């Protein structure tokens, strides 16, 4: 297939200022300045900017491009977002789990897969993990064949791959454009963007397009470049390389000099002629949630940060606190003693869950490839990261802490008292979480977002009501409690304790009080902090943390359907 | 001056096996792999690595190195260590303030920068300031020349530059070797490493030195090189260069074969001939403390976040704690209040000096080549560093949050009882800052240090005893209180508030209680805390602090002291 | 223990009403909490503030910068001053003791009538 | 605040019959609720003091017998000496408030 662009211009203030060629079954290089368009181009080329600023033509075999060219056609990013935990083998069924159509046999997804793997040299690497930071495992250059490998799955007549070879050593890079021209033999059109080549790559070129300040210097043939600039006016030494020298002539040793010379010159009007005559979801939500899921529960499974870590931590942390308040008294330091450990649960269940942050936006970059690639909706995406990666790492240690101090402290021996805590336990780490994620979602960086976690909870802590009295505060700042997350679990867990308890060992205060400031029984207690006694007193703090969860998770939702792809 | 290595052999396990050369003045390259010997020889021969593996000999002009070597000779970092909100002006400044000689009058050393200044081309940017994060500033080129400048002050014979061109576009690393070659010119040995040179750099060399794997492979005249080469049995065409056709025979388009033709090369033989031939503080801790306070201080008023942000926070978070707080009354609500709002003032105290972690760890590259090159003693830094920037911004936010909650709280109406507050709000910023010293001095990131101290401070925070008794605590627990800064600034602040407060509206309760349990003075609340009552119950928590100051602090210096340099 | 207020029984709007309350058999620095409490023409009672045995002192929000509760512990005297009076708040205003452990009002005295008329 | 309140303005009894006084709190009261007898041109005397306990110097013919937000006195076998105004009192939150007040009148 030959890909042909006419008077193609760019504007955000325009960066390609107009621009024409033709791209042909070959190897084909687009260089310059980093600044340059070099890297726009391939992005108008690919349908990966956005279609509002693009105001040219781009046409495939003469006919316009499709909008399911991004289905079509492969995309190779520059820093590989393969699964560094998963192997080759699992990376490549997961193209194919989702870009390969329903209809197949698993067997002929398996031819497919049999026939890429093959094709890209990866036999020794099959079933070796791809690298992680706590996994030594496959090399630079089979991590960017792996890469590559992802879009051959669909088998496409275009590759388009951003900067390649910019990030690899020589002696790999030579290699991997190697293997890039005996795929460009097969009729596949492979069109690439490089950072200063040596002269060992640019003997390789079927095709050169070259680009500085959103100009175009030169289109044609990759070889005639050099003779077509010494005809120019400017000489190459012996001993020095091409490649560099056109960047030298673009940097001085102007630009309008260099763009009315091009429009001038006979490679312009042969590609001028050409283009005048020229111009004469795949798949369900349910398959798309099944298979998000097991990539992610993987992904989990693969690291000791994100599971192991967090356990150990969780227990020690519980066996500490089942030390200090071993056996809770009925005395006048009992009271004390209930507040503080309640307080302790609830507040360590929101600083915890802070690490949700980093849930979506160390995805970020795989995620908007894969979602433009057409591999999945938003809301299966969504919901199956939910559902493998959140959802297990929030009841397992509400479930650990609520087993290891409850019956070291000696919390009320019922056992729906213990099933309400664990509960609560569990509900004001999703809210947390949730509030997280509404946070996180469609940033790029975990500080700016951990820091404003951190700031928002200090101040819910203050309106938790063990700091001040919730009753006491001016009517104008009290609305403001109803906003705190650790408020909610905080009340339930204080309702669920202190109920039925007396704290005057020798006063029965249950019919009377004899000296009117004594504070002897748990309804005292929970009444002085504004708590209310009736059942919907319990209640009404878990139905606050649904609603919570509910807002917070659909923030969080409209933040990735309404983020900028392109 | 000639520098001259004989028999050079290097081990951490060999990293050099054994190398020969002479160096001279003009433009010396050395090249080779990353991970070869390219690095580590310029090191060995600059005496910046630890003279514990060296097992060769290394001559200037025939005789040894001195001792006084690292003061004598220049060496340029490759990624630049420069001030960026200094002027450049500044920056040679203060390397003229404590590398000349004290003898020297201020216009004798501004005749040295001008002279300097001058011969770098500097002088449109002299007074501009160097750039940082929030501040545009001089161009990577002129950061560059500047930090080239701080070396020249001395006048050294030997100049040394790790990678000089790394991390600059072509244009301006062409800009910065013509400039080196001019300073050659001059009489002075110019002796650096590169990352695989263009053509039209790889001309301008007067000697080249090639390594890979820990052997040495060519050492001669520069242009000698291709010739050799060719000559050993390889090909050079045409448009291709040198520099990068000798890294290509280094990965076999063996390293063993490559070395042992070098052994019996001519250009071997003539090097050891010549190698046979041969062979047959400045300045007060006071004047040291001043500049290194002045440069801190100069950086502390060039940053917003480092001052102006923290001050906002502080009277931000004063005002709304002023708010939640204001009117304290002499209730049943009365005691919960002053304890829970004292609690957040100490424990705040302790999470924003958390950001004491970064003061030593962005200074580490800075500091470590300032030290091996001699500006200063580790007493001299360390001291006016403290005196600098942390006396200062632990001042003013204690002095900040005492002025704006007192009077809007209500608490004791008396002139020491307001200044106590002040000065305990005060030694507790200090500790915990001292401790953050201790845990982040000599670390080179910031994540794994603040995450040690924030799990330092919640445990210390539990022991503060306000969510747990601490009379109740188990006593092979209990130890573990005297180990926490929050609970002695807690403590000095509830002996301060409590002691003369009545709590029971409308009964006197200072000779007797009608029924106890009914806590009705602040006496008998810190009584039930386990607090003593005596003035000594007050000071014993300010002796408490000023130990672990003293401390850590010391850990802190002994940390600076006991670092490895090399 | 025995209670007795006085004043100006008849005051105009606008201005500021006024009682002395005496106390004897007990001192008013020695231990309870005193009160002023207002009853209104069409029986309901109003609790209007204190002052405390050791002078702290304490209002009903209704009252909002109106009244101010004072003593002279010279003569076991305390003082209602109740400015900006109005002719709604003609009243029998009462004196009476806050006994603290116990939490009643258990002595008061007789009370004193004021009228507020244009 | 707390609104206490008396549920009749005034019943109307027999000598020697018995007769209940309902008191209702907004907010959960924890038996600090007291009972005020008034008789005409006189202060209100304390009867009830936390809401089960009498007063020295009352008949054992008055108790109460409240709990939670609701709270009552009871009267059995009155006598002509027991004819006024009868008021609840709270003194749980530091804004005092009394009910109503409910009259007894002869029939």
């Known amino acids: 297939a030959v890909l042909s662009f006419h008077n193609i211009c760019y504007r955000v203030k325009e960066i390609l200022s107009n621009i024409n060629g033709i791209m042909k079954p070959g190897l084909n290089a687009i260089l310059g300045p980093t600044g340059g368009g070099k890297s726009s181009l391939l992005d108008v080329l690919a349908a990966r900017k956005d279609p509002s600023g693009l105001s040219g033509d781009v046409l495939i075999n003469g006919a316009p491009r499709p909008a399911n060219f991004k289905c079509n056609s492969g995309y190779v990013v520059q820093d590989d977002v393969v699964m560094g935990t998963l192997t080759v083998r699992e990376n490549l069924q997961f193209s194919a789990a989702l870009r390969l159509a329903t209809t197949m046999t698993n067997h002929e997804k398996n031819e497919r897969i049999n026939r890429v793997i093959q094709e890209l040299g990866l036999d020794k690497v099959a079933d070796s993990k791809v690298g992680t930071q706590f996994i030594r495992g496959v090399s630079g250059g089979e991590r960017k064949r792996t890469s590559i490998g992802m879009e051959l799955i669909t088998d496409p007549s275009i590759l388009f791959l951003d900067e390649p070879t910019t990030g690899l050593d020589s002696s790999t890079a030579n290699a991997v454009l190697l293997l890039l021209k005996r795929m460009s033999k097969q009729g596949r059109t492979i069109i690439f963007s490089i950072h200063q080549p040596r002269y060992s790559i640019f003997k390789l070129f079927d095709s050169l397009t070259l680009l500085a300040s959103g100009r175009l210097m030169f289109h044609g043939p990759a070889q005639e470049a050099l003779g077509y600039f010494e005809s120019a006016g400017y000489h190459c030494e012996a001993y020095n390389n091409p490649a560099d020298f056109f960047l030298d002539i673009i940097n001085g040793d102007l630009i309008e000099k260099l763009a009315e010379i091009y429009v001038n010159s006979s490679f312009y009007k042969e590609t001028k002629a050409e283009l005048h005559q020229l111009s004469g979801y795949t798949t369900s939500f349910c398959h798309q949630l099944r298979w998000v899921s097991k990539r992610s529960f993987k992904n989990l499974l693969g690291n000791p940060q994100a599971s192991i870590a967090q356990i150990i931590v969780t227990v020690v942390l519980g066996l500490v606190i089942g030390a200090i308040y071993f056996g809770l008294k009925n005395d006048s330091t009992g009271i004390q003693n209930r507040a503080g450990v309640l307080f302790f649960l609830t507040t360590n269940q929101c600083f915890s869950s802070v690490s949700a942050v980093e849930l979506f936006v160390v995805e970020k970059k795989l995620f908007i490839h894969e979602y433009i690639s057409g591999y999945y909706r938003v809301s299966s995406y969504f919901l199956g990261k939910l559902l493998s990666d959140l959802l297990p790492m929030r009841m397992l240690p509400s479930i650990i802490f609520t087993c290891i101090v409850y019956f070291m402290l000696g919390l009320k021996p019922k056992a729906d008292a213990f099933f309400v805590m664990m509960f609560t336990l569990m509900m004001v780490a999703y809210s947390a979480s949730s509030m997280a994620l509404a946070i996180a979602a469609g940033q790029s960086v975990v500080s700016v977002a951990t820091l404003l976690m951190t700031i928002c909870f200090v101040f819910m802590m203050i309106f938790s009501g063990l700091l001040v009295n919730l009753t006491t505060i001016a009517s104008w700042l009290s609305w403001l409690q109803y906003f705190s997350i650790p408020r909610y679990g905080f009340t339930a867990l204080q309702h669920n304790e202190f109920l039925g308890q007396n704290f005057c060992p020798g006063l029965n205060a249950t019919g009377n009080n004899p000296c009117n400031y004594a504070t002897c029984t748990g309804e005292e207690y929970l009444v002085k902090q504004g708590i209310d006694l009736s059942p919907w007193g319990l209640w009404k703090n878990h139905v606050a943390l649904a609603c919570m969860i509910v807002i917070f998770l659909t923030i969080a939702y409209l933040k990735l359907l309404f983020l900028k792809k392109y | 001056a000639v520098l001259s290595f004989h028999n050079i052999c290097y081990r951490v396990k060999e990293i050099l096996s054994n190398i020969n050369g002479i160096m001279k003045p003009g433009l010396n390259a050395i090249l080779g792999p990353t991970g070869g010997g390219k690095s580590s020889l310029l090191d060995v021969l600059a005496a910046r690595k630890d003279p514990s593996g060296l097992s060769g000999d290394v001559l200037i002009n025939g005789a040894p190195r001195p001792a006084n070597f690292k003061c004598n000779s220049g060496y340029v970092v490759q990624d630049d260590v420069v001030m960026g909100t200094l002027t450049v002006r500044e920056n040679l400044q203060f390397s003229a303030a404590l590398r000349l000689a004290t003898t020297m009058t201020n216009h004798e050393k501004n005749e040295r920068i001008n002279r300097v200044i001058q011969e770098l081309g500097l002088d449109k940017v002299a007074d501009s300031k160097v750039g940082t994060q929030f501040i545009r500033g001089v161009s990577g080129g002129e950061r560059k020349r500047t930090s080239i400048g701080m070396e020249l002050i001395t006048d050294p014979s030997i100049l040394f530059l790790d990678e000089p061109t790394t991390g600059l576009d072509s244009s301006t690393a062409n800009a910065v070797l013509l400039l080196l070659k001019r300073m050659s010119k001059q009489g002075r040995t110019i002796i650096f490493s590169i990352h695989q040179p263009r053509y039209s750099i790889f001309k301008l060399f007067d000697s080249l030195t090639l390594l890979a794997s820990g052997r040495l492979m060519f050492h001669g005249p520069a242009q000698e090189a291709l010739g050799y080469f060719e000559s050993a049995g390889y090909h050079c065409e045409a448009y291709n260069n040198p520099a990068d056709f000798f890294l290509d025979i280094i990965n076999g388009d063996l390293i063993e074969k490559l070395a042992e033709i070098y052994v019996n090369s001519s250009f071997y033989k003539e090097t050891k001939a010549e190698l046979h031939q041969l062979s047959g503080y400045t300045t007060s801790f006071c004047h040291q403390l001043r500049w290194v306070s002045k440069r801190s201080f100069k950086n502390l008023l060039g940053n917003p976040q480092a001052s102006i942000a923290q001050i906002i926070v502080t009277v931000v978070l004063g005002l709304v704690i002023g708010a939640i707080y204001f009117g304290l009354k002499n209730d049943s609500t009365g005691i919960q209040n002053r304890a829970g709002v004292l609690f957040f003032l100490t424990t705040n105290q302790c999470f924003s000096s958390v950001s004491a972690v970064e003061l030593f760890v962005v200074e580490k590259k800075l500091f470590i080549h300032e030290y091996i090159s001699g500006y200063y003693r580790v007493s001299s830094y360390f001291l006016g560093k403290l005196l600098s920037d942390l006396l200062p911004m632990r001042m003013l936010p204690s002095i900040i949050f005492t002025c704006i909650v007192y009077f809007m709280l209500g608490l004791k109406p008396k002139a020491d009882a307001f200044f106590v507050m002040m000065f305990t709000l005060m030694m507790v910023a200090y500790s915990a800052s001292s401790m953050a010293l201790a845990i982040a001095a000599g670390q080179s990131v910031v994540s794994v240090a603040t995450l040690l101290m924030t799990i330092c401070f919640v445990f210390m925070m539990i022991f503060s005893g306000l969510l747990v008794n601490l009379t109740t605590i188990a006593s092979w627990l209990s130890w573990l209180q005297y180990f926490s800064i929050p609970r002695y600034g807690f403590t000095a602040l509830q002996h301060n508030e409590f002691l003369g407060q009545n709590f029971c509206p409308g009964l006197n309760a200072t000779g007797n209680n009608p029924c106890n349990y009914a806590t009705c003075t602040g006496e008998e609340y810190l009584v039930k805390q386990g607090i003593d009552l005596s003035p000594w119950g007050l000071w014993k928590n300010h002796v408490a602090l000023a130990c672990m100051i003293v401390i850590f602090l010391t850990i802190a210096y002994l940390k600076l002291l006991f670092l490895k340099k090399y | 223990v025995q209670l007795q207020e006085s004043g100006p029984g008849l005051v105009k709007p606008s201005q500021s009403l006024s009682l002395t309350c005496t106390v004897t058999?007990?001192?008013?620095?020695?231990?309870?909490?005193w009160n002023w409490i207002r009853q209104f023409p069409g029986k309901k009672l109003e609790w209007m503030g204190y002052?405390?045995?050791?002078?702290?002192?304490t209002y009903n929000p209704s009252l909002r910068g109106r009244i101010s509760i004072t003593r002279d512990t010279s003569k076991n005297q305390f003082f209602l001053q109740l400015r900006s009076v109005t002719p709604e708040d003609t009243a029998t205003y009462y004196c009476?003791?806050?006994?603290?452990?116990?939490?009643?009002?258990?002595?008061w005295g007789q009370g004193t009538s004021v009228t507020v008329s244009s | 605040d707390i609104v206490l309140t008396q549920s009749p303005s005034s019943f109307s009894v027999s000598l020697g019959d018995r007769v209940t006084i309902s008191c209702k709190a907004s907010?959960?009261?924890?038996?600090?609720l007291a009972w005020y007898q008034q008789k005409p041109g006189n202060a209100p005397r304390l009867l009830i003091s936390?809401?089960?306990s009498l007063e020295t110097g009352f008949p054992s013919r008055f108790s109460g017998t409240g709990s939670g937000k609701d709270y009552t006195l009871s009267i059995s076998s009155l006598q002509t000496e027991d004819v006024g105004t009868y008021y609840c009192?709270?003194?749980?939150?530091?804004?005092?408030?009394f009910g109503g007040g409910t009259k007894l009148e002869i029939r």
């Open positions: 009192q709270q003194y749980w939150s530091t804004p005092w408030t």
């Open positions: 936390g809401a089960t």
């Open positions: 907010g959960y009261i924890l038996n600090r």
């Open positions: 002052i405390n045995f050791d002078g702290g002192t």
């Open positions: 058999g007990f001192s008013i620095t020695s231990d309870y909490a």
């Open positions: 009476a003791t806050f006994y603290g452990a116990k939490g009643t009002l258990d002595y």
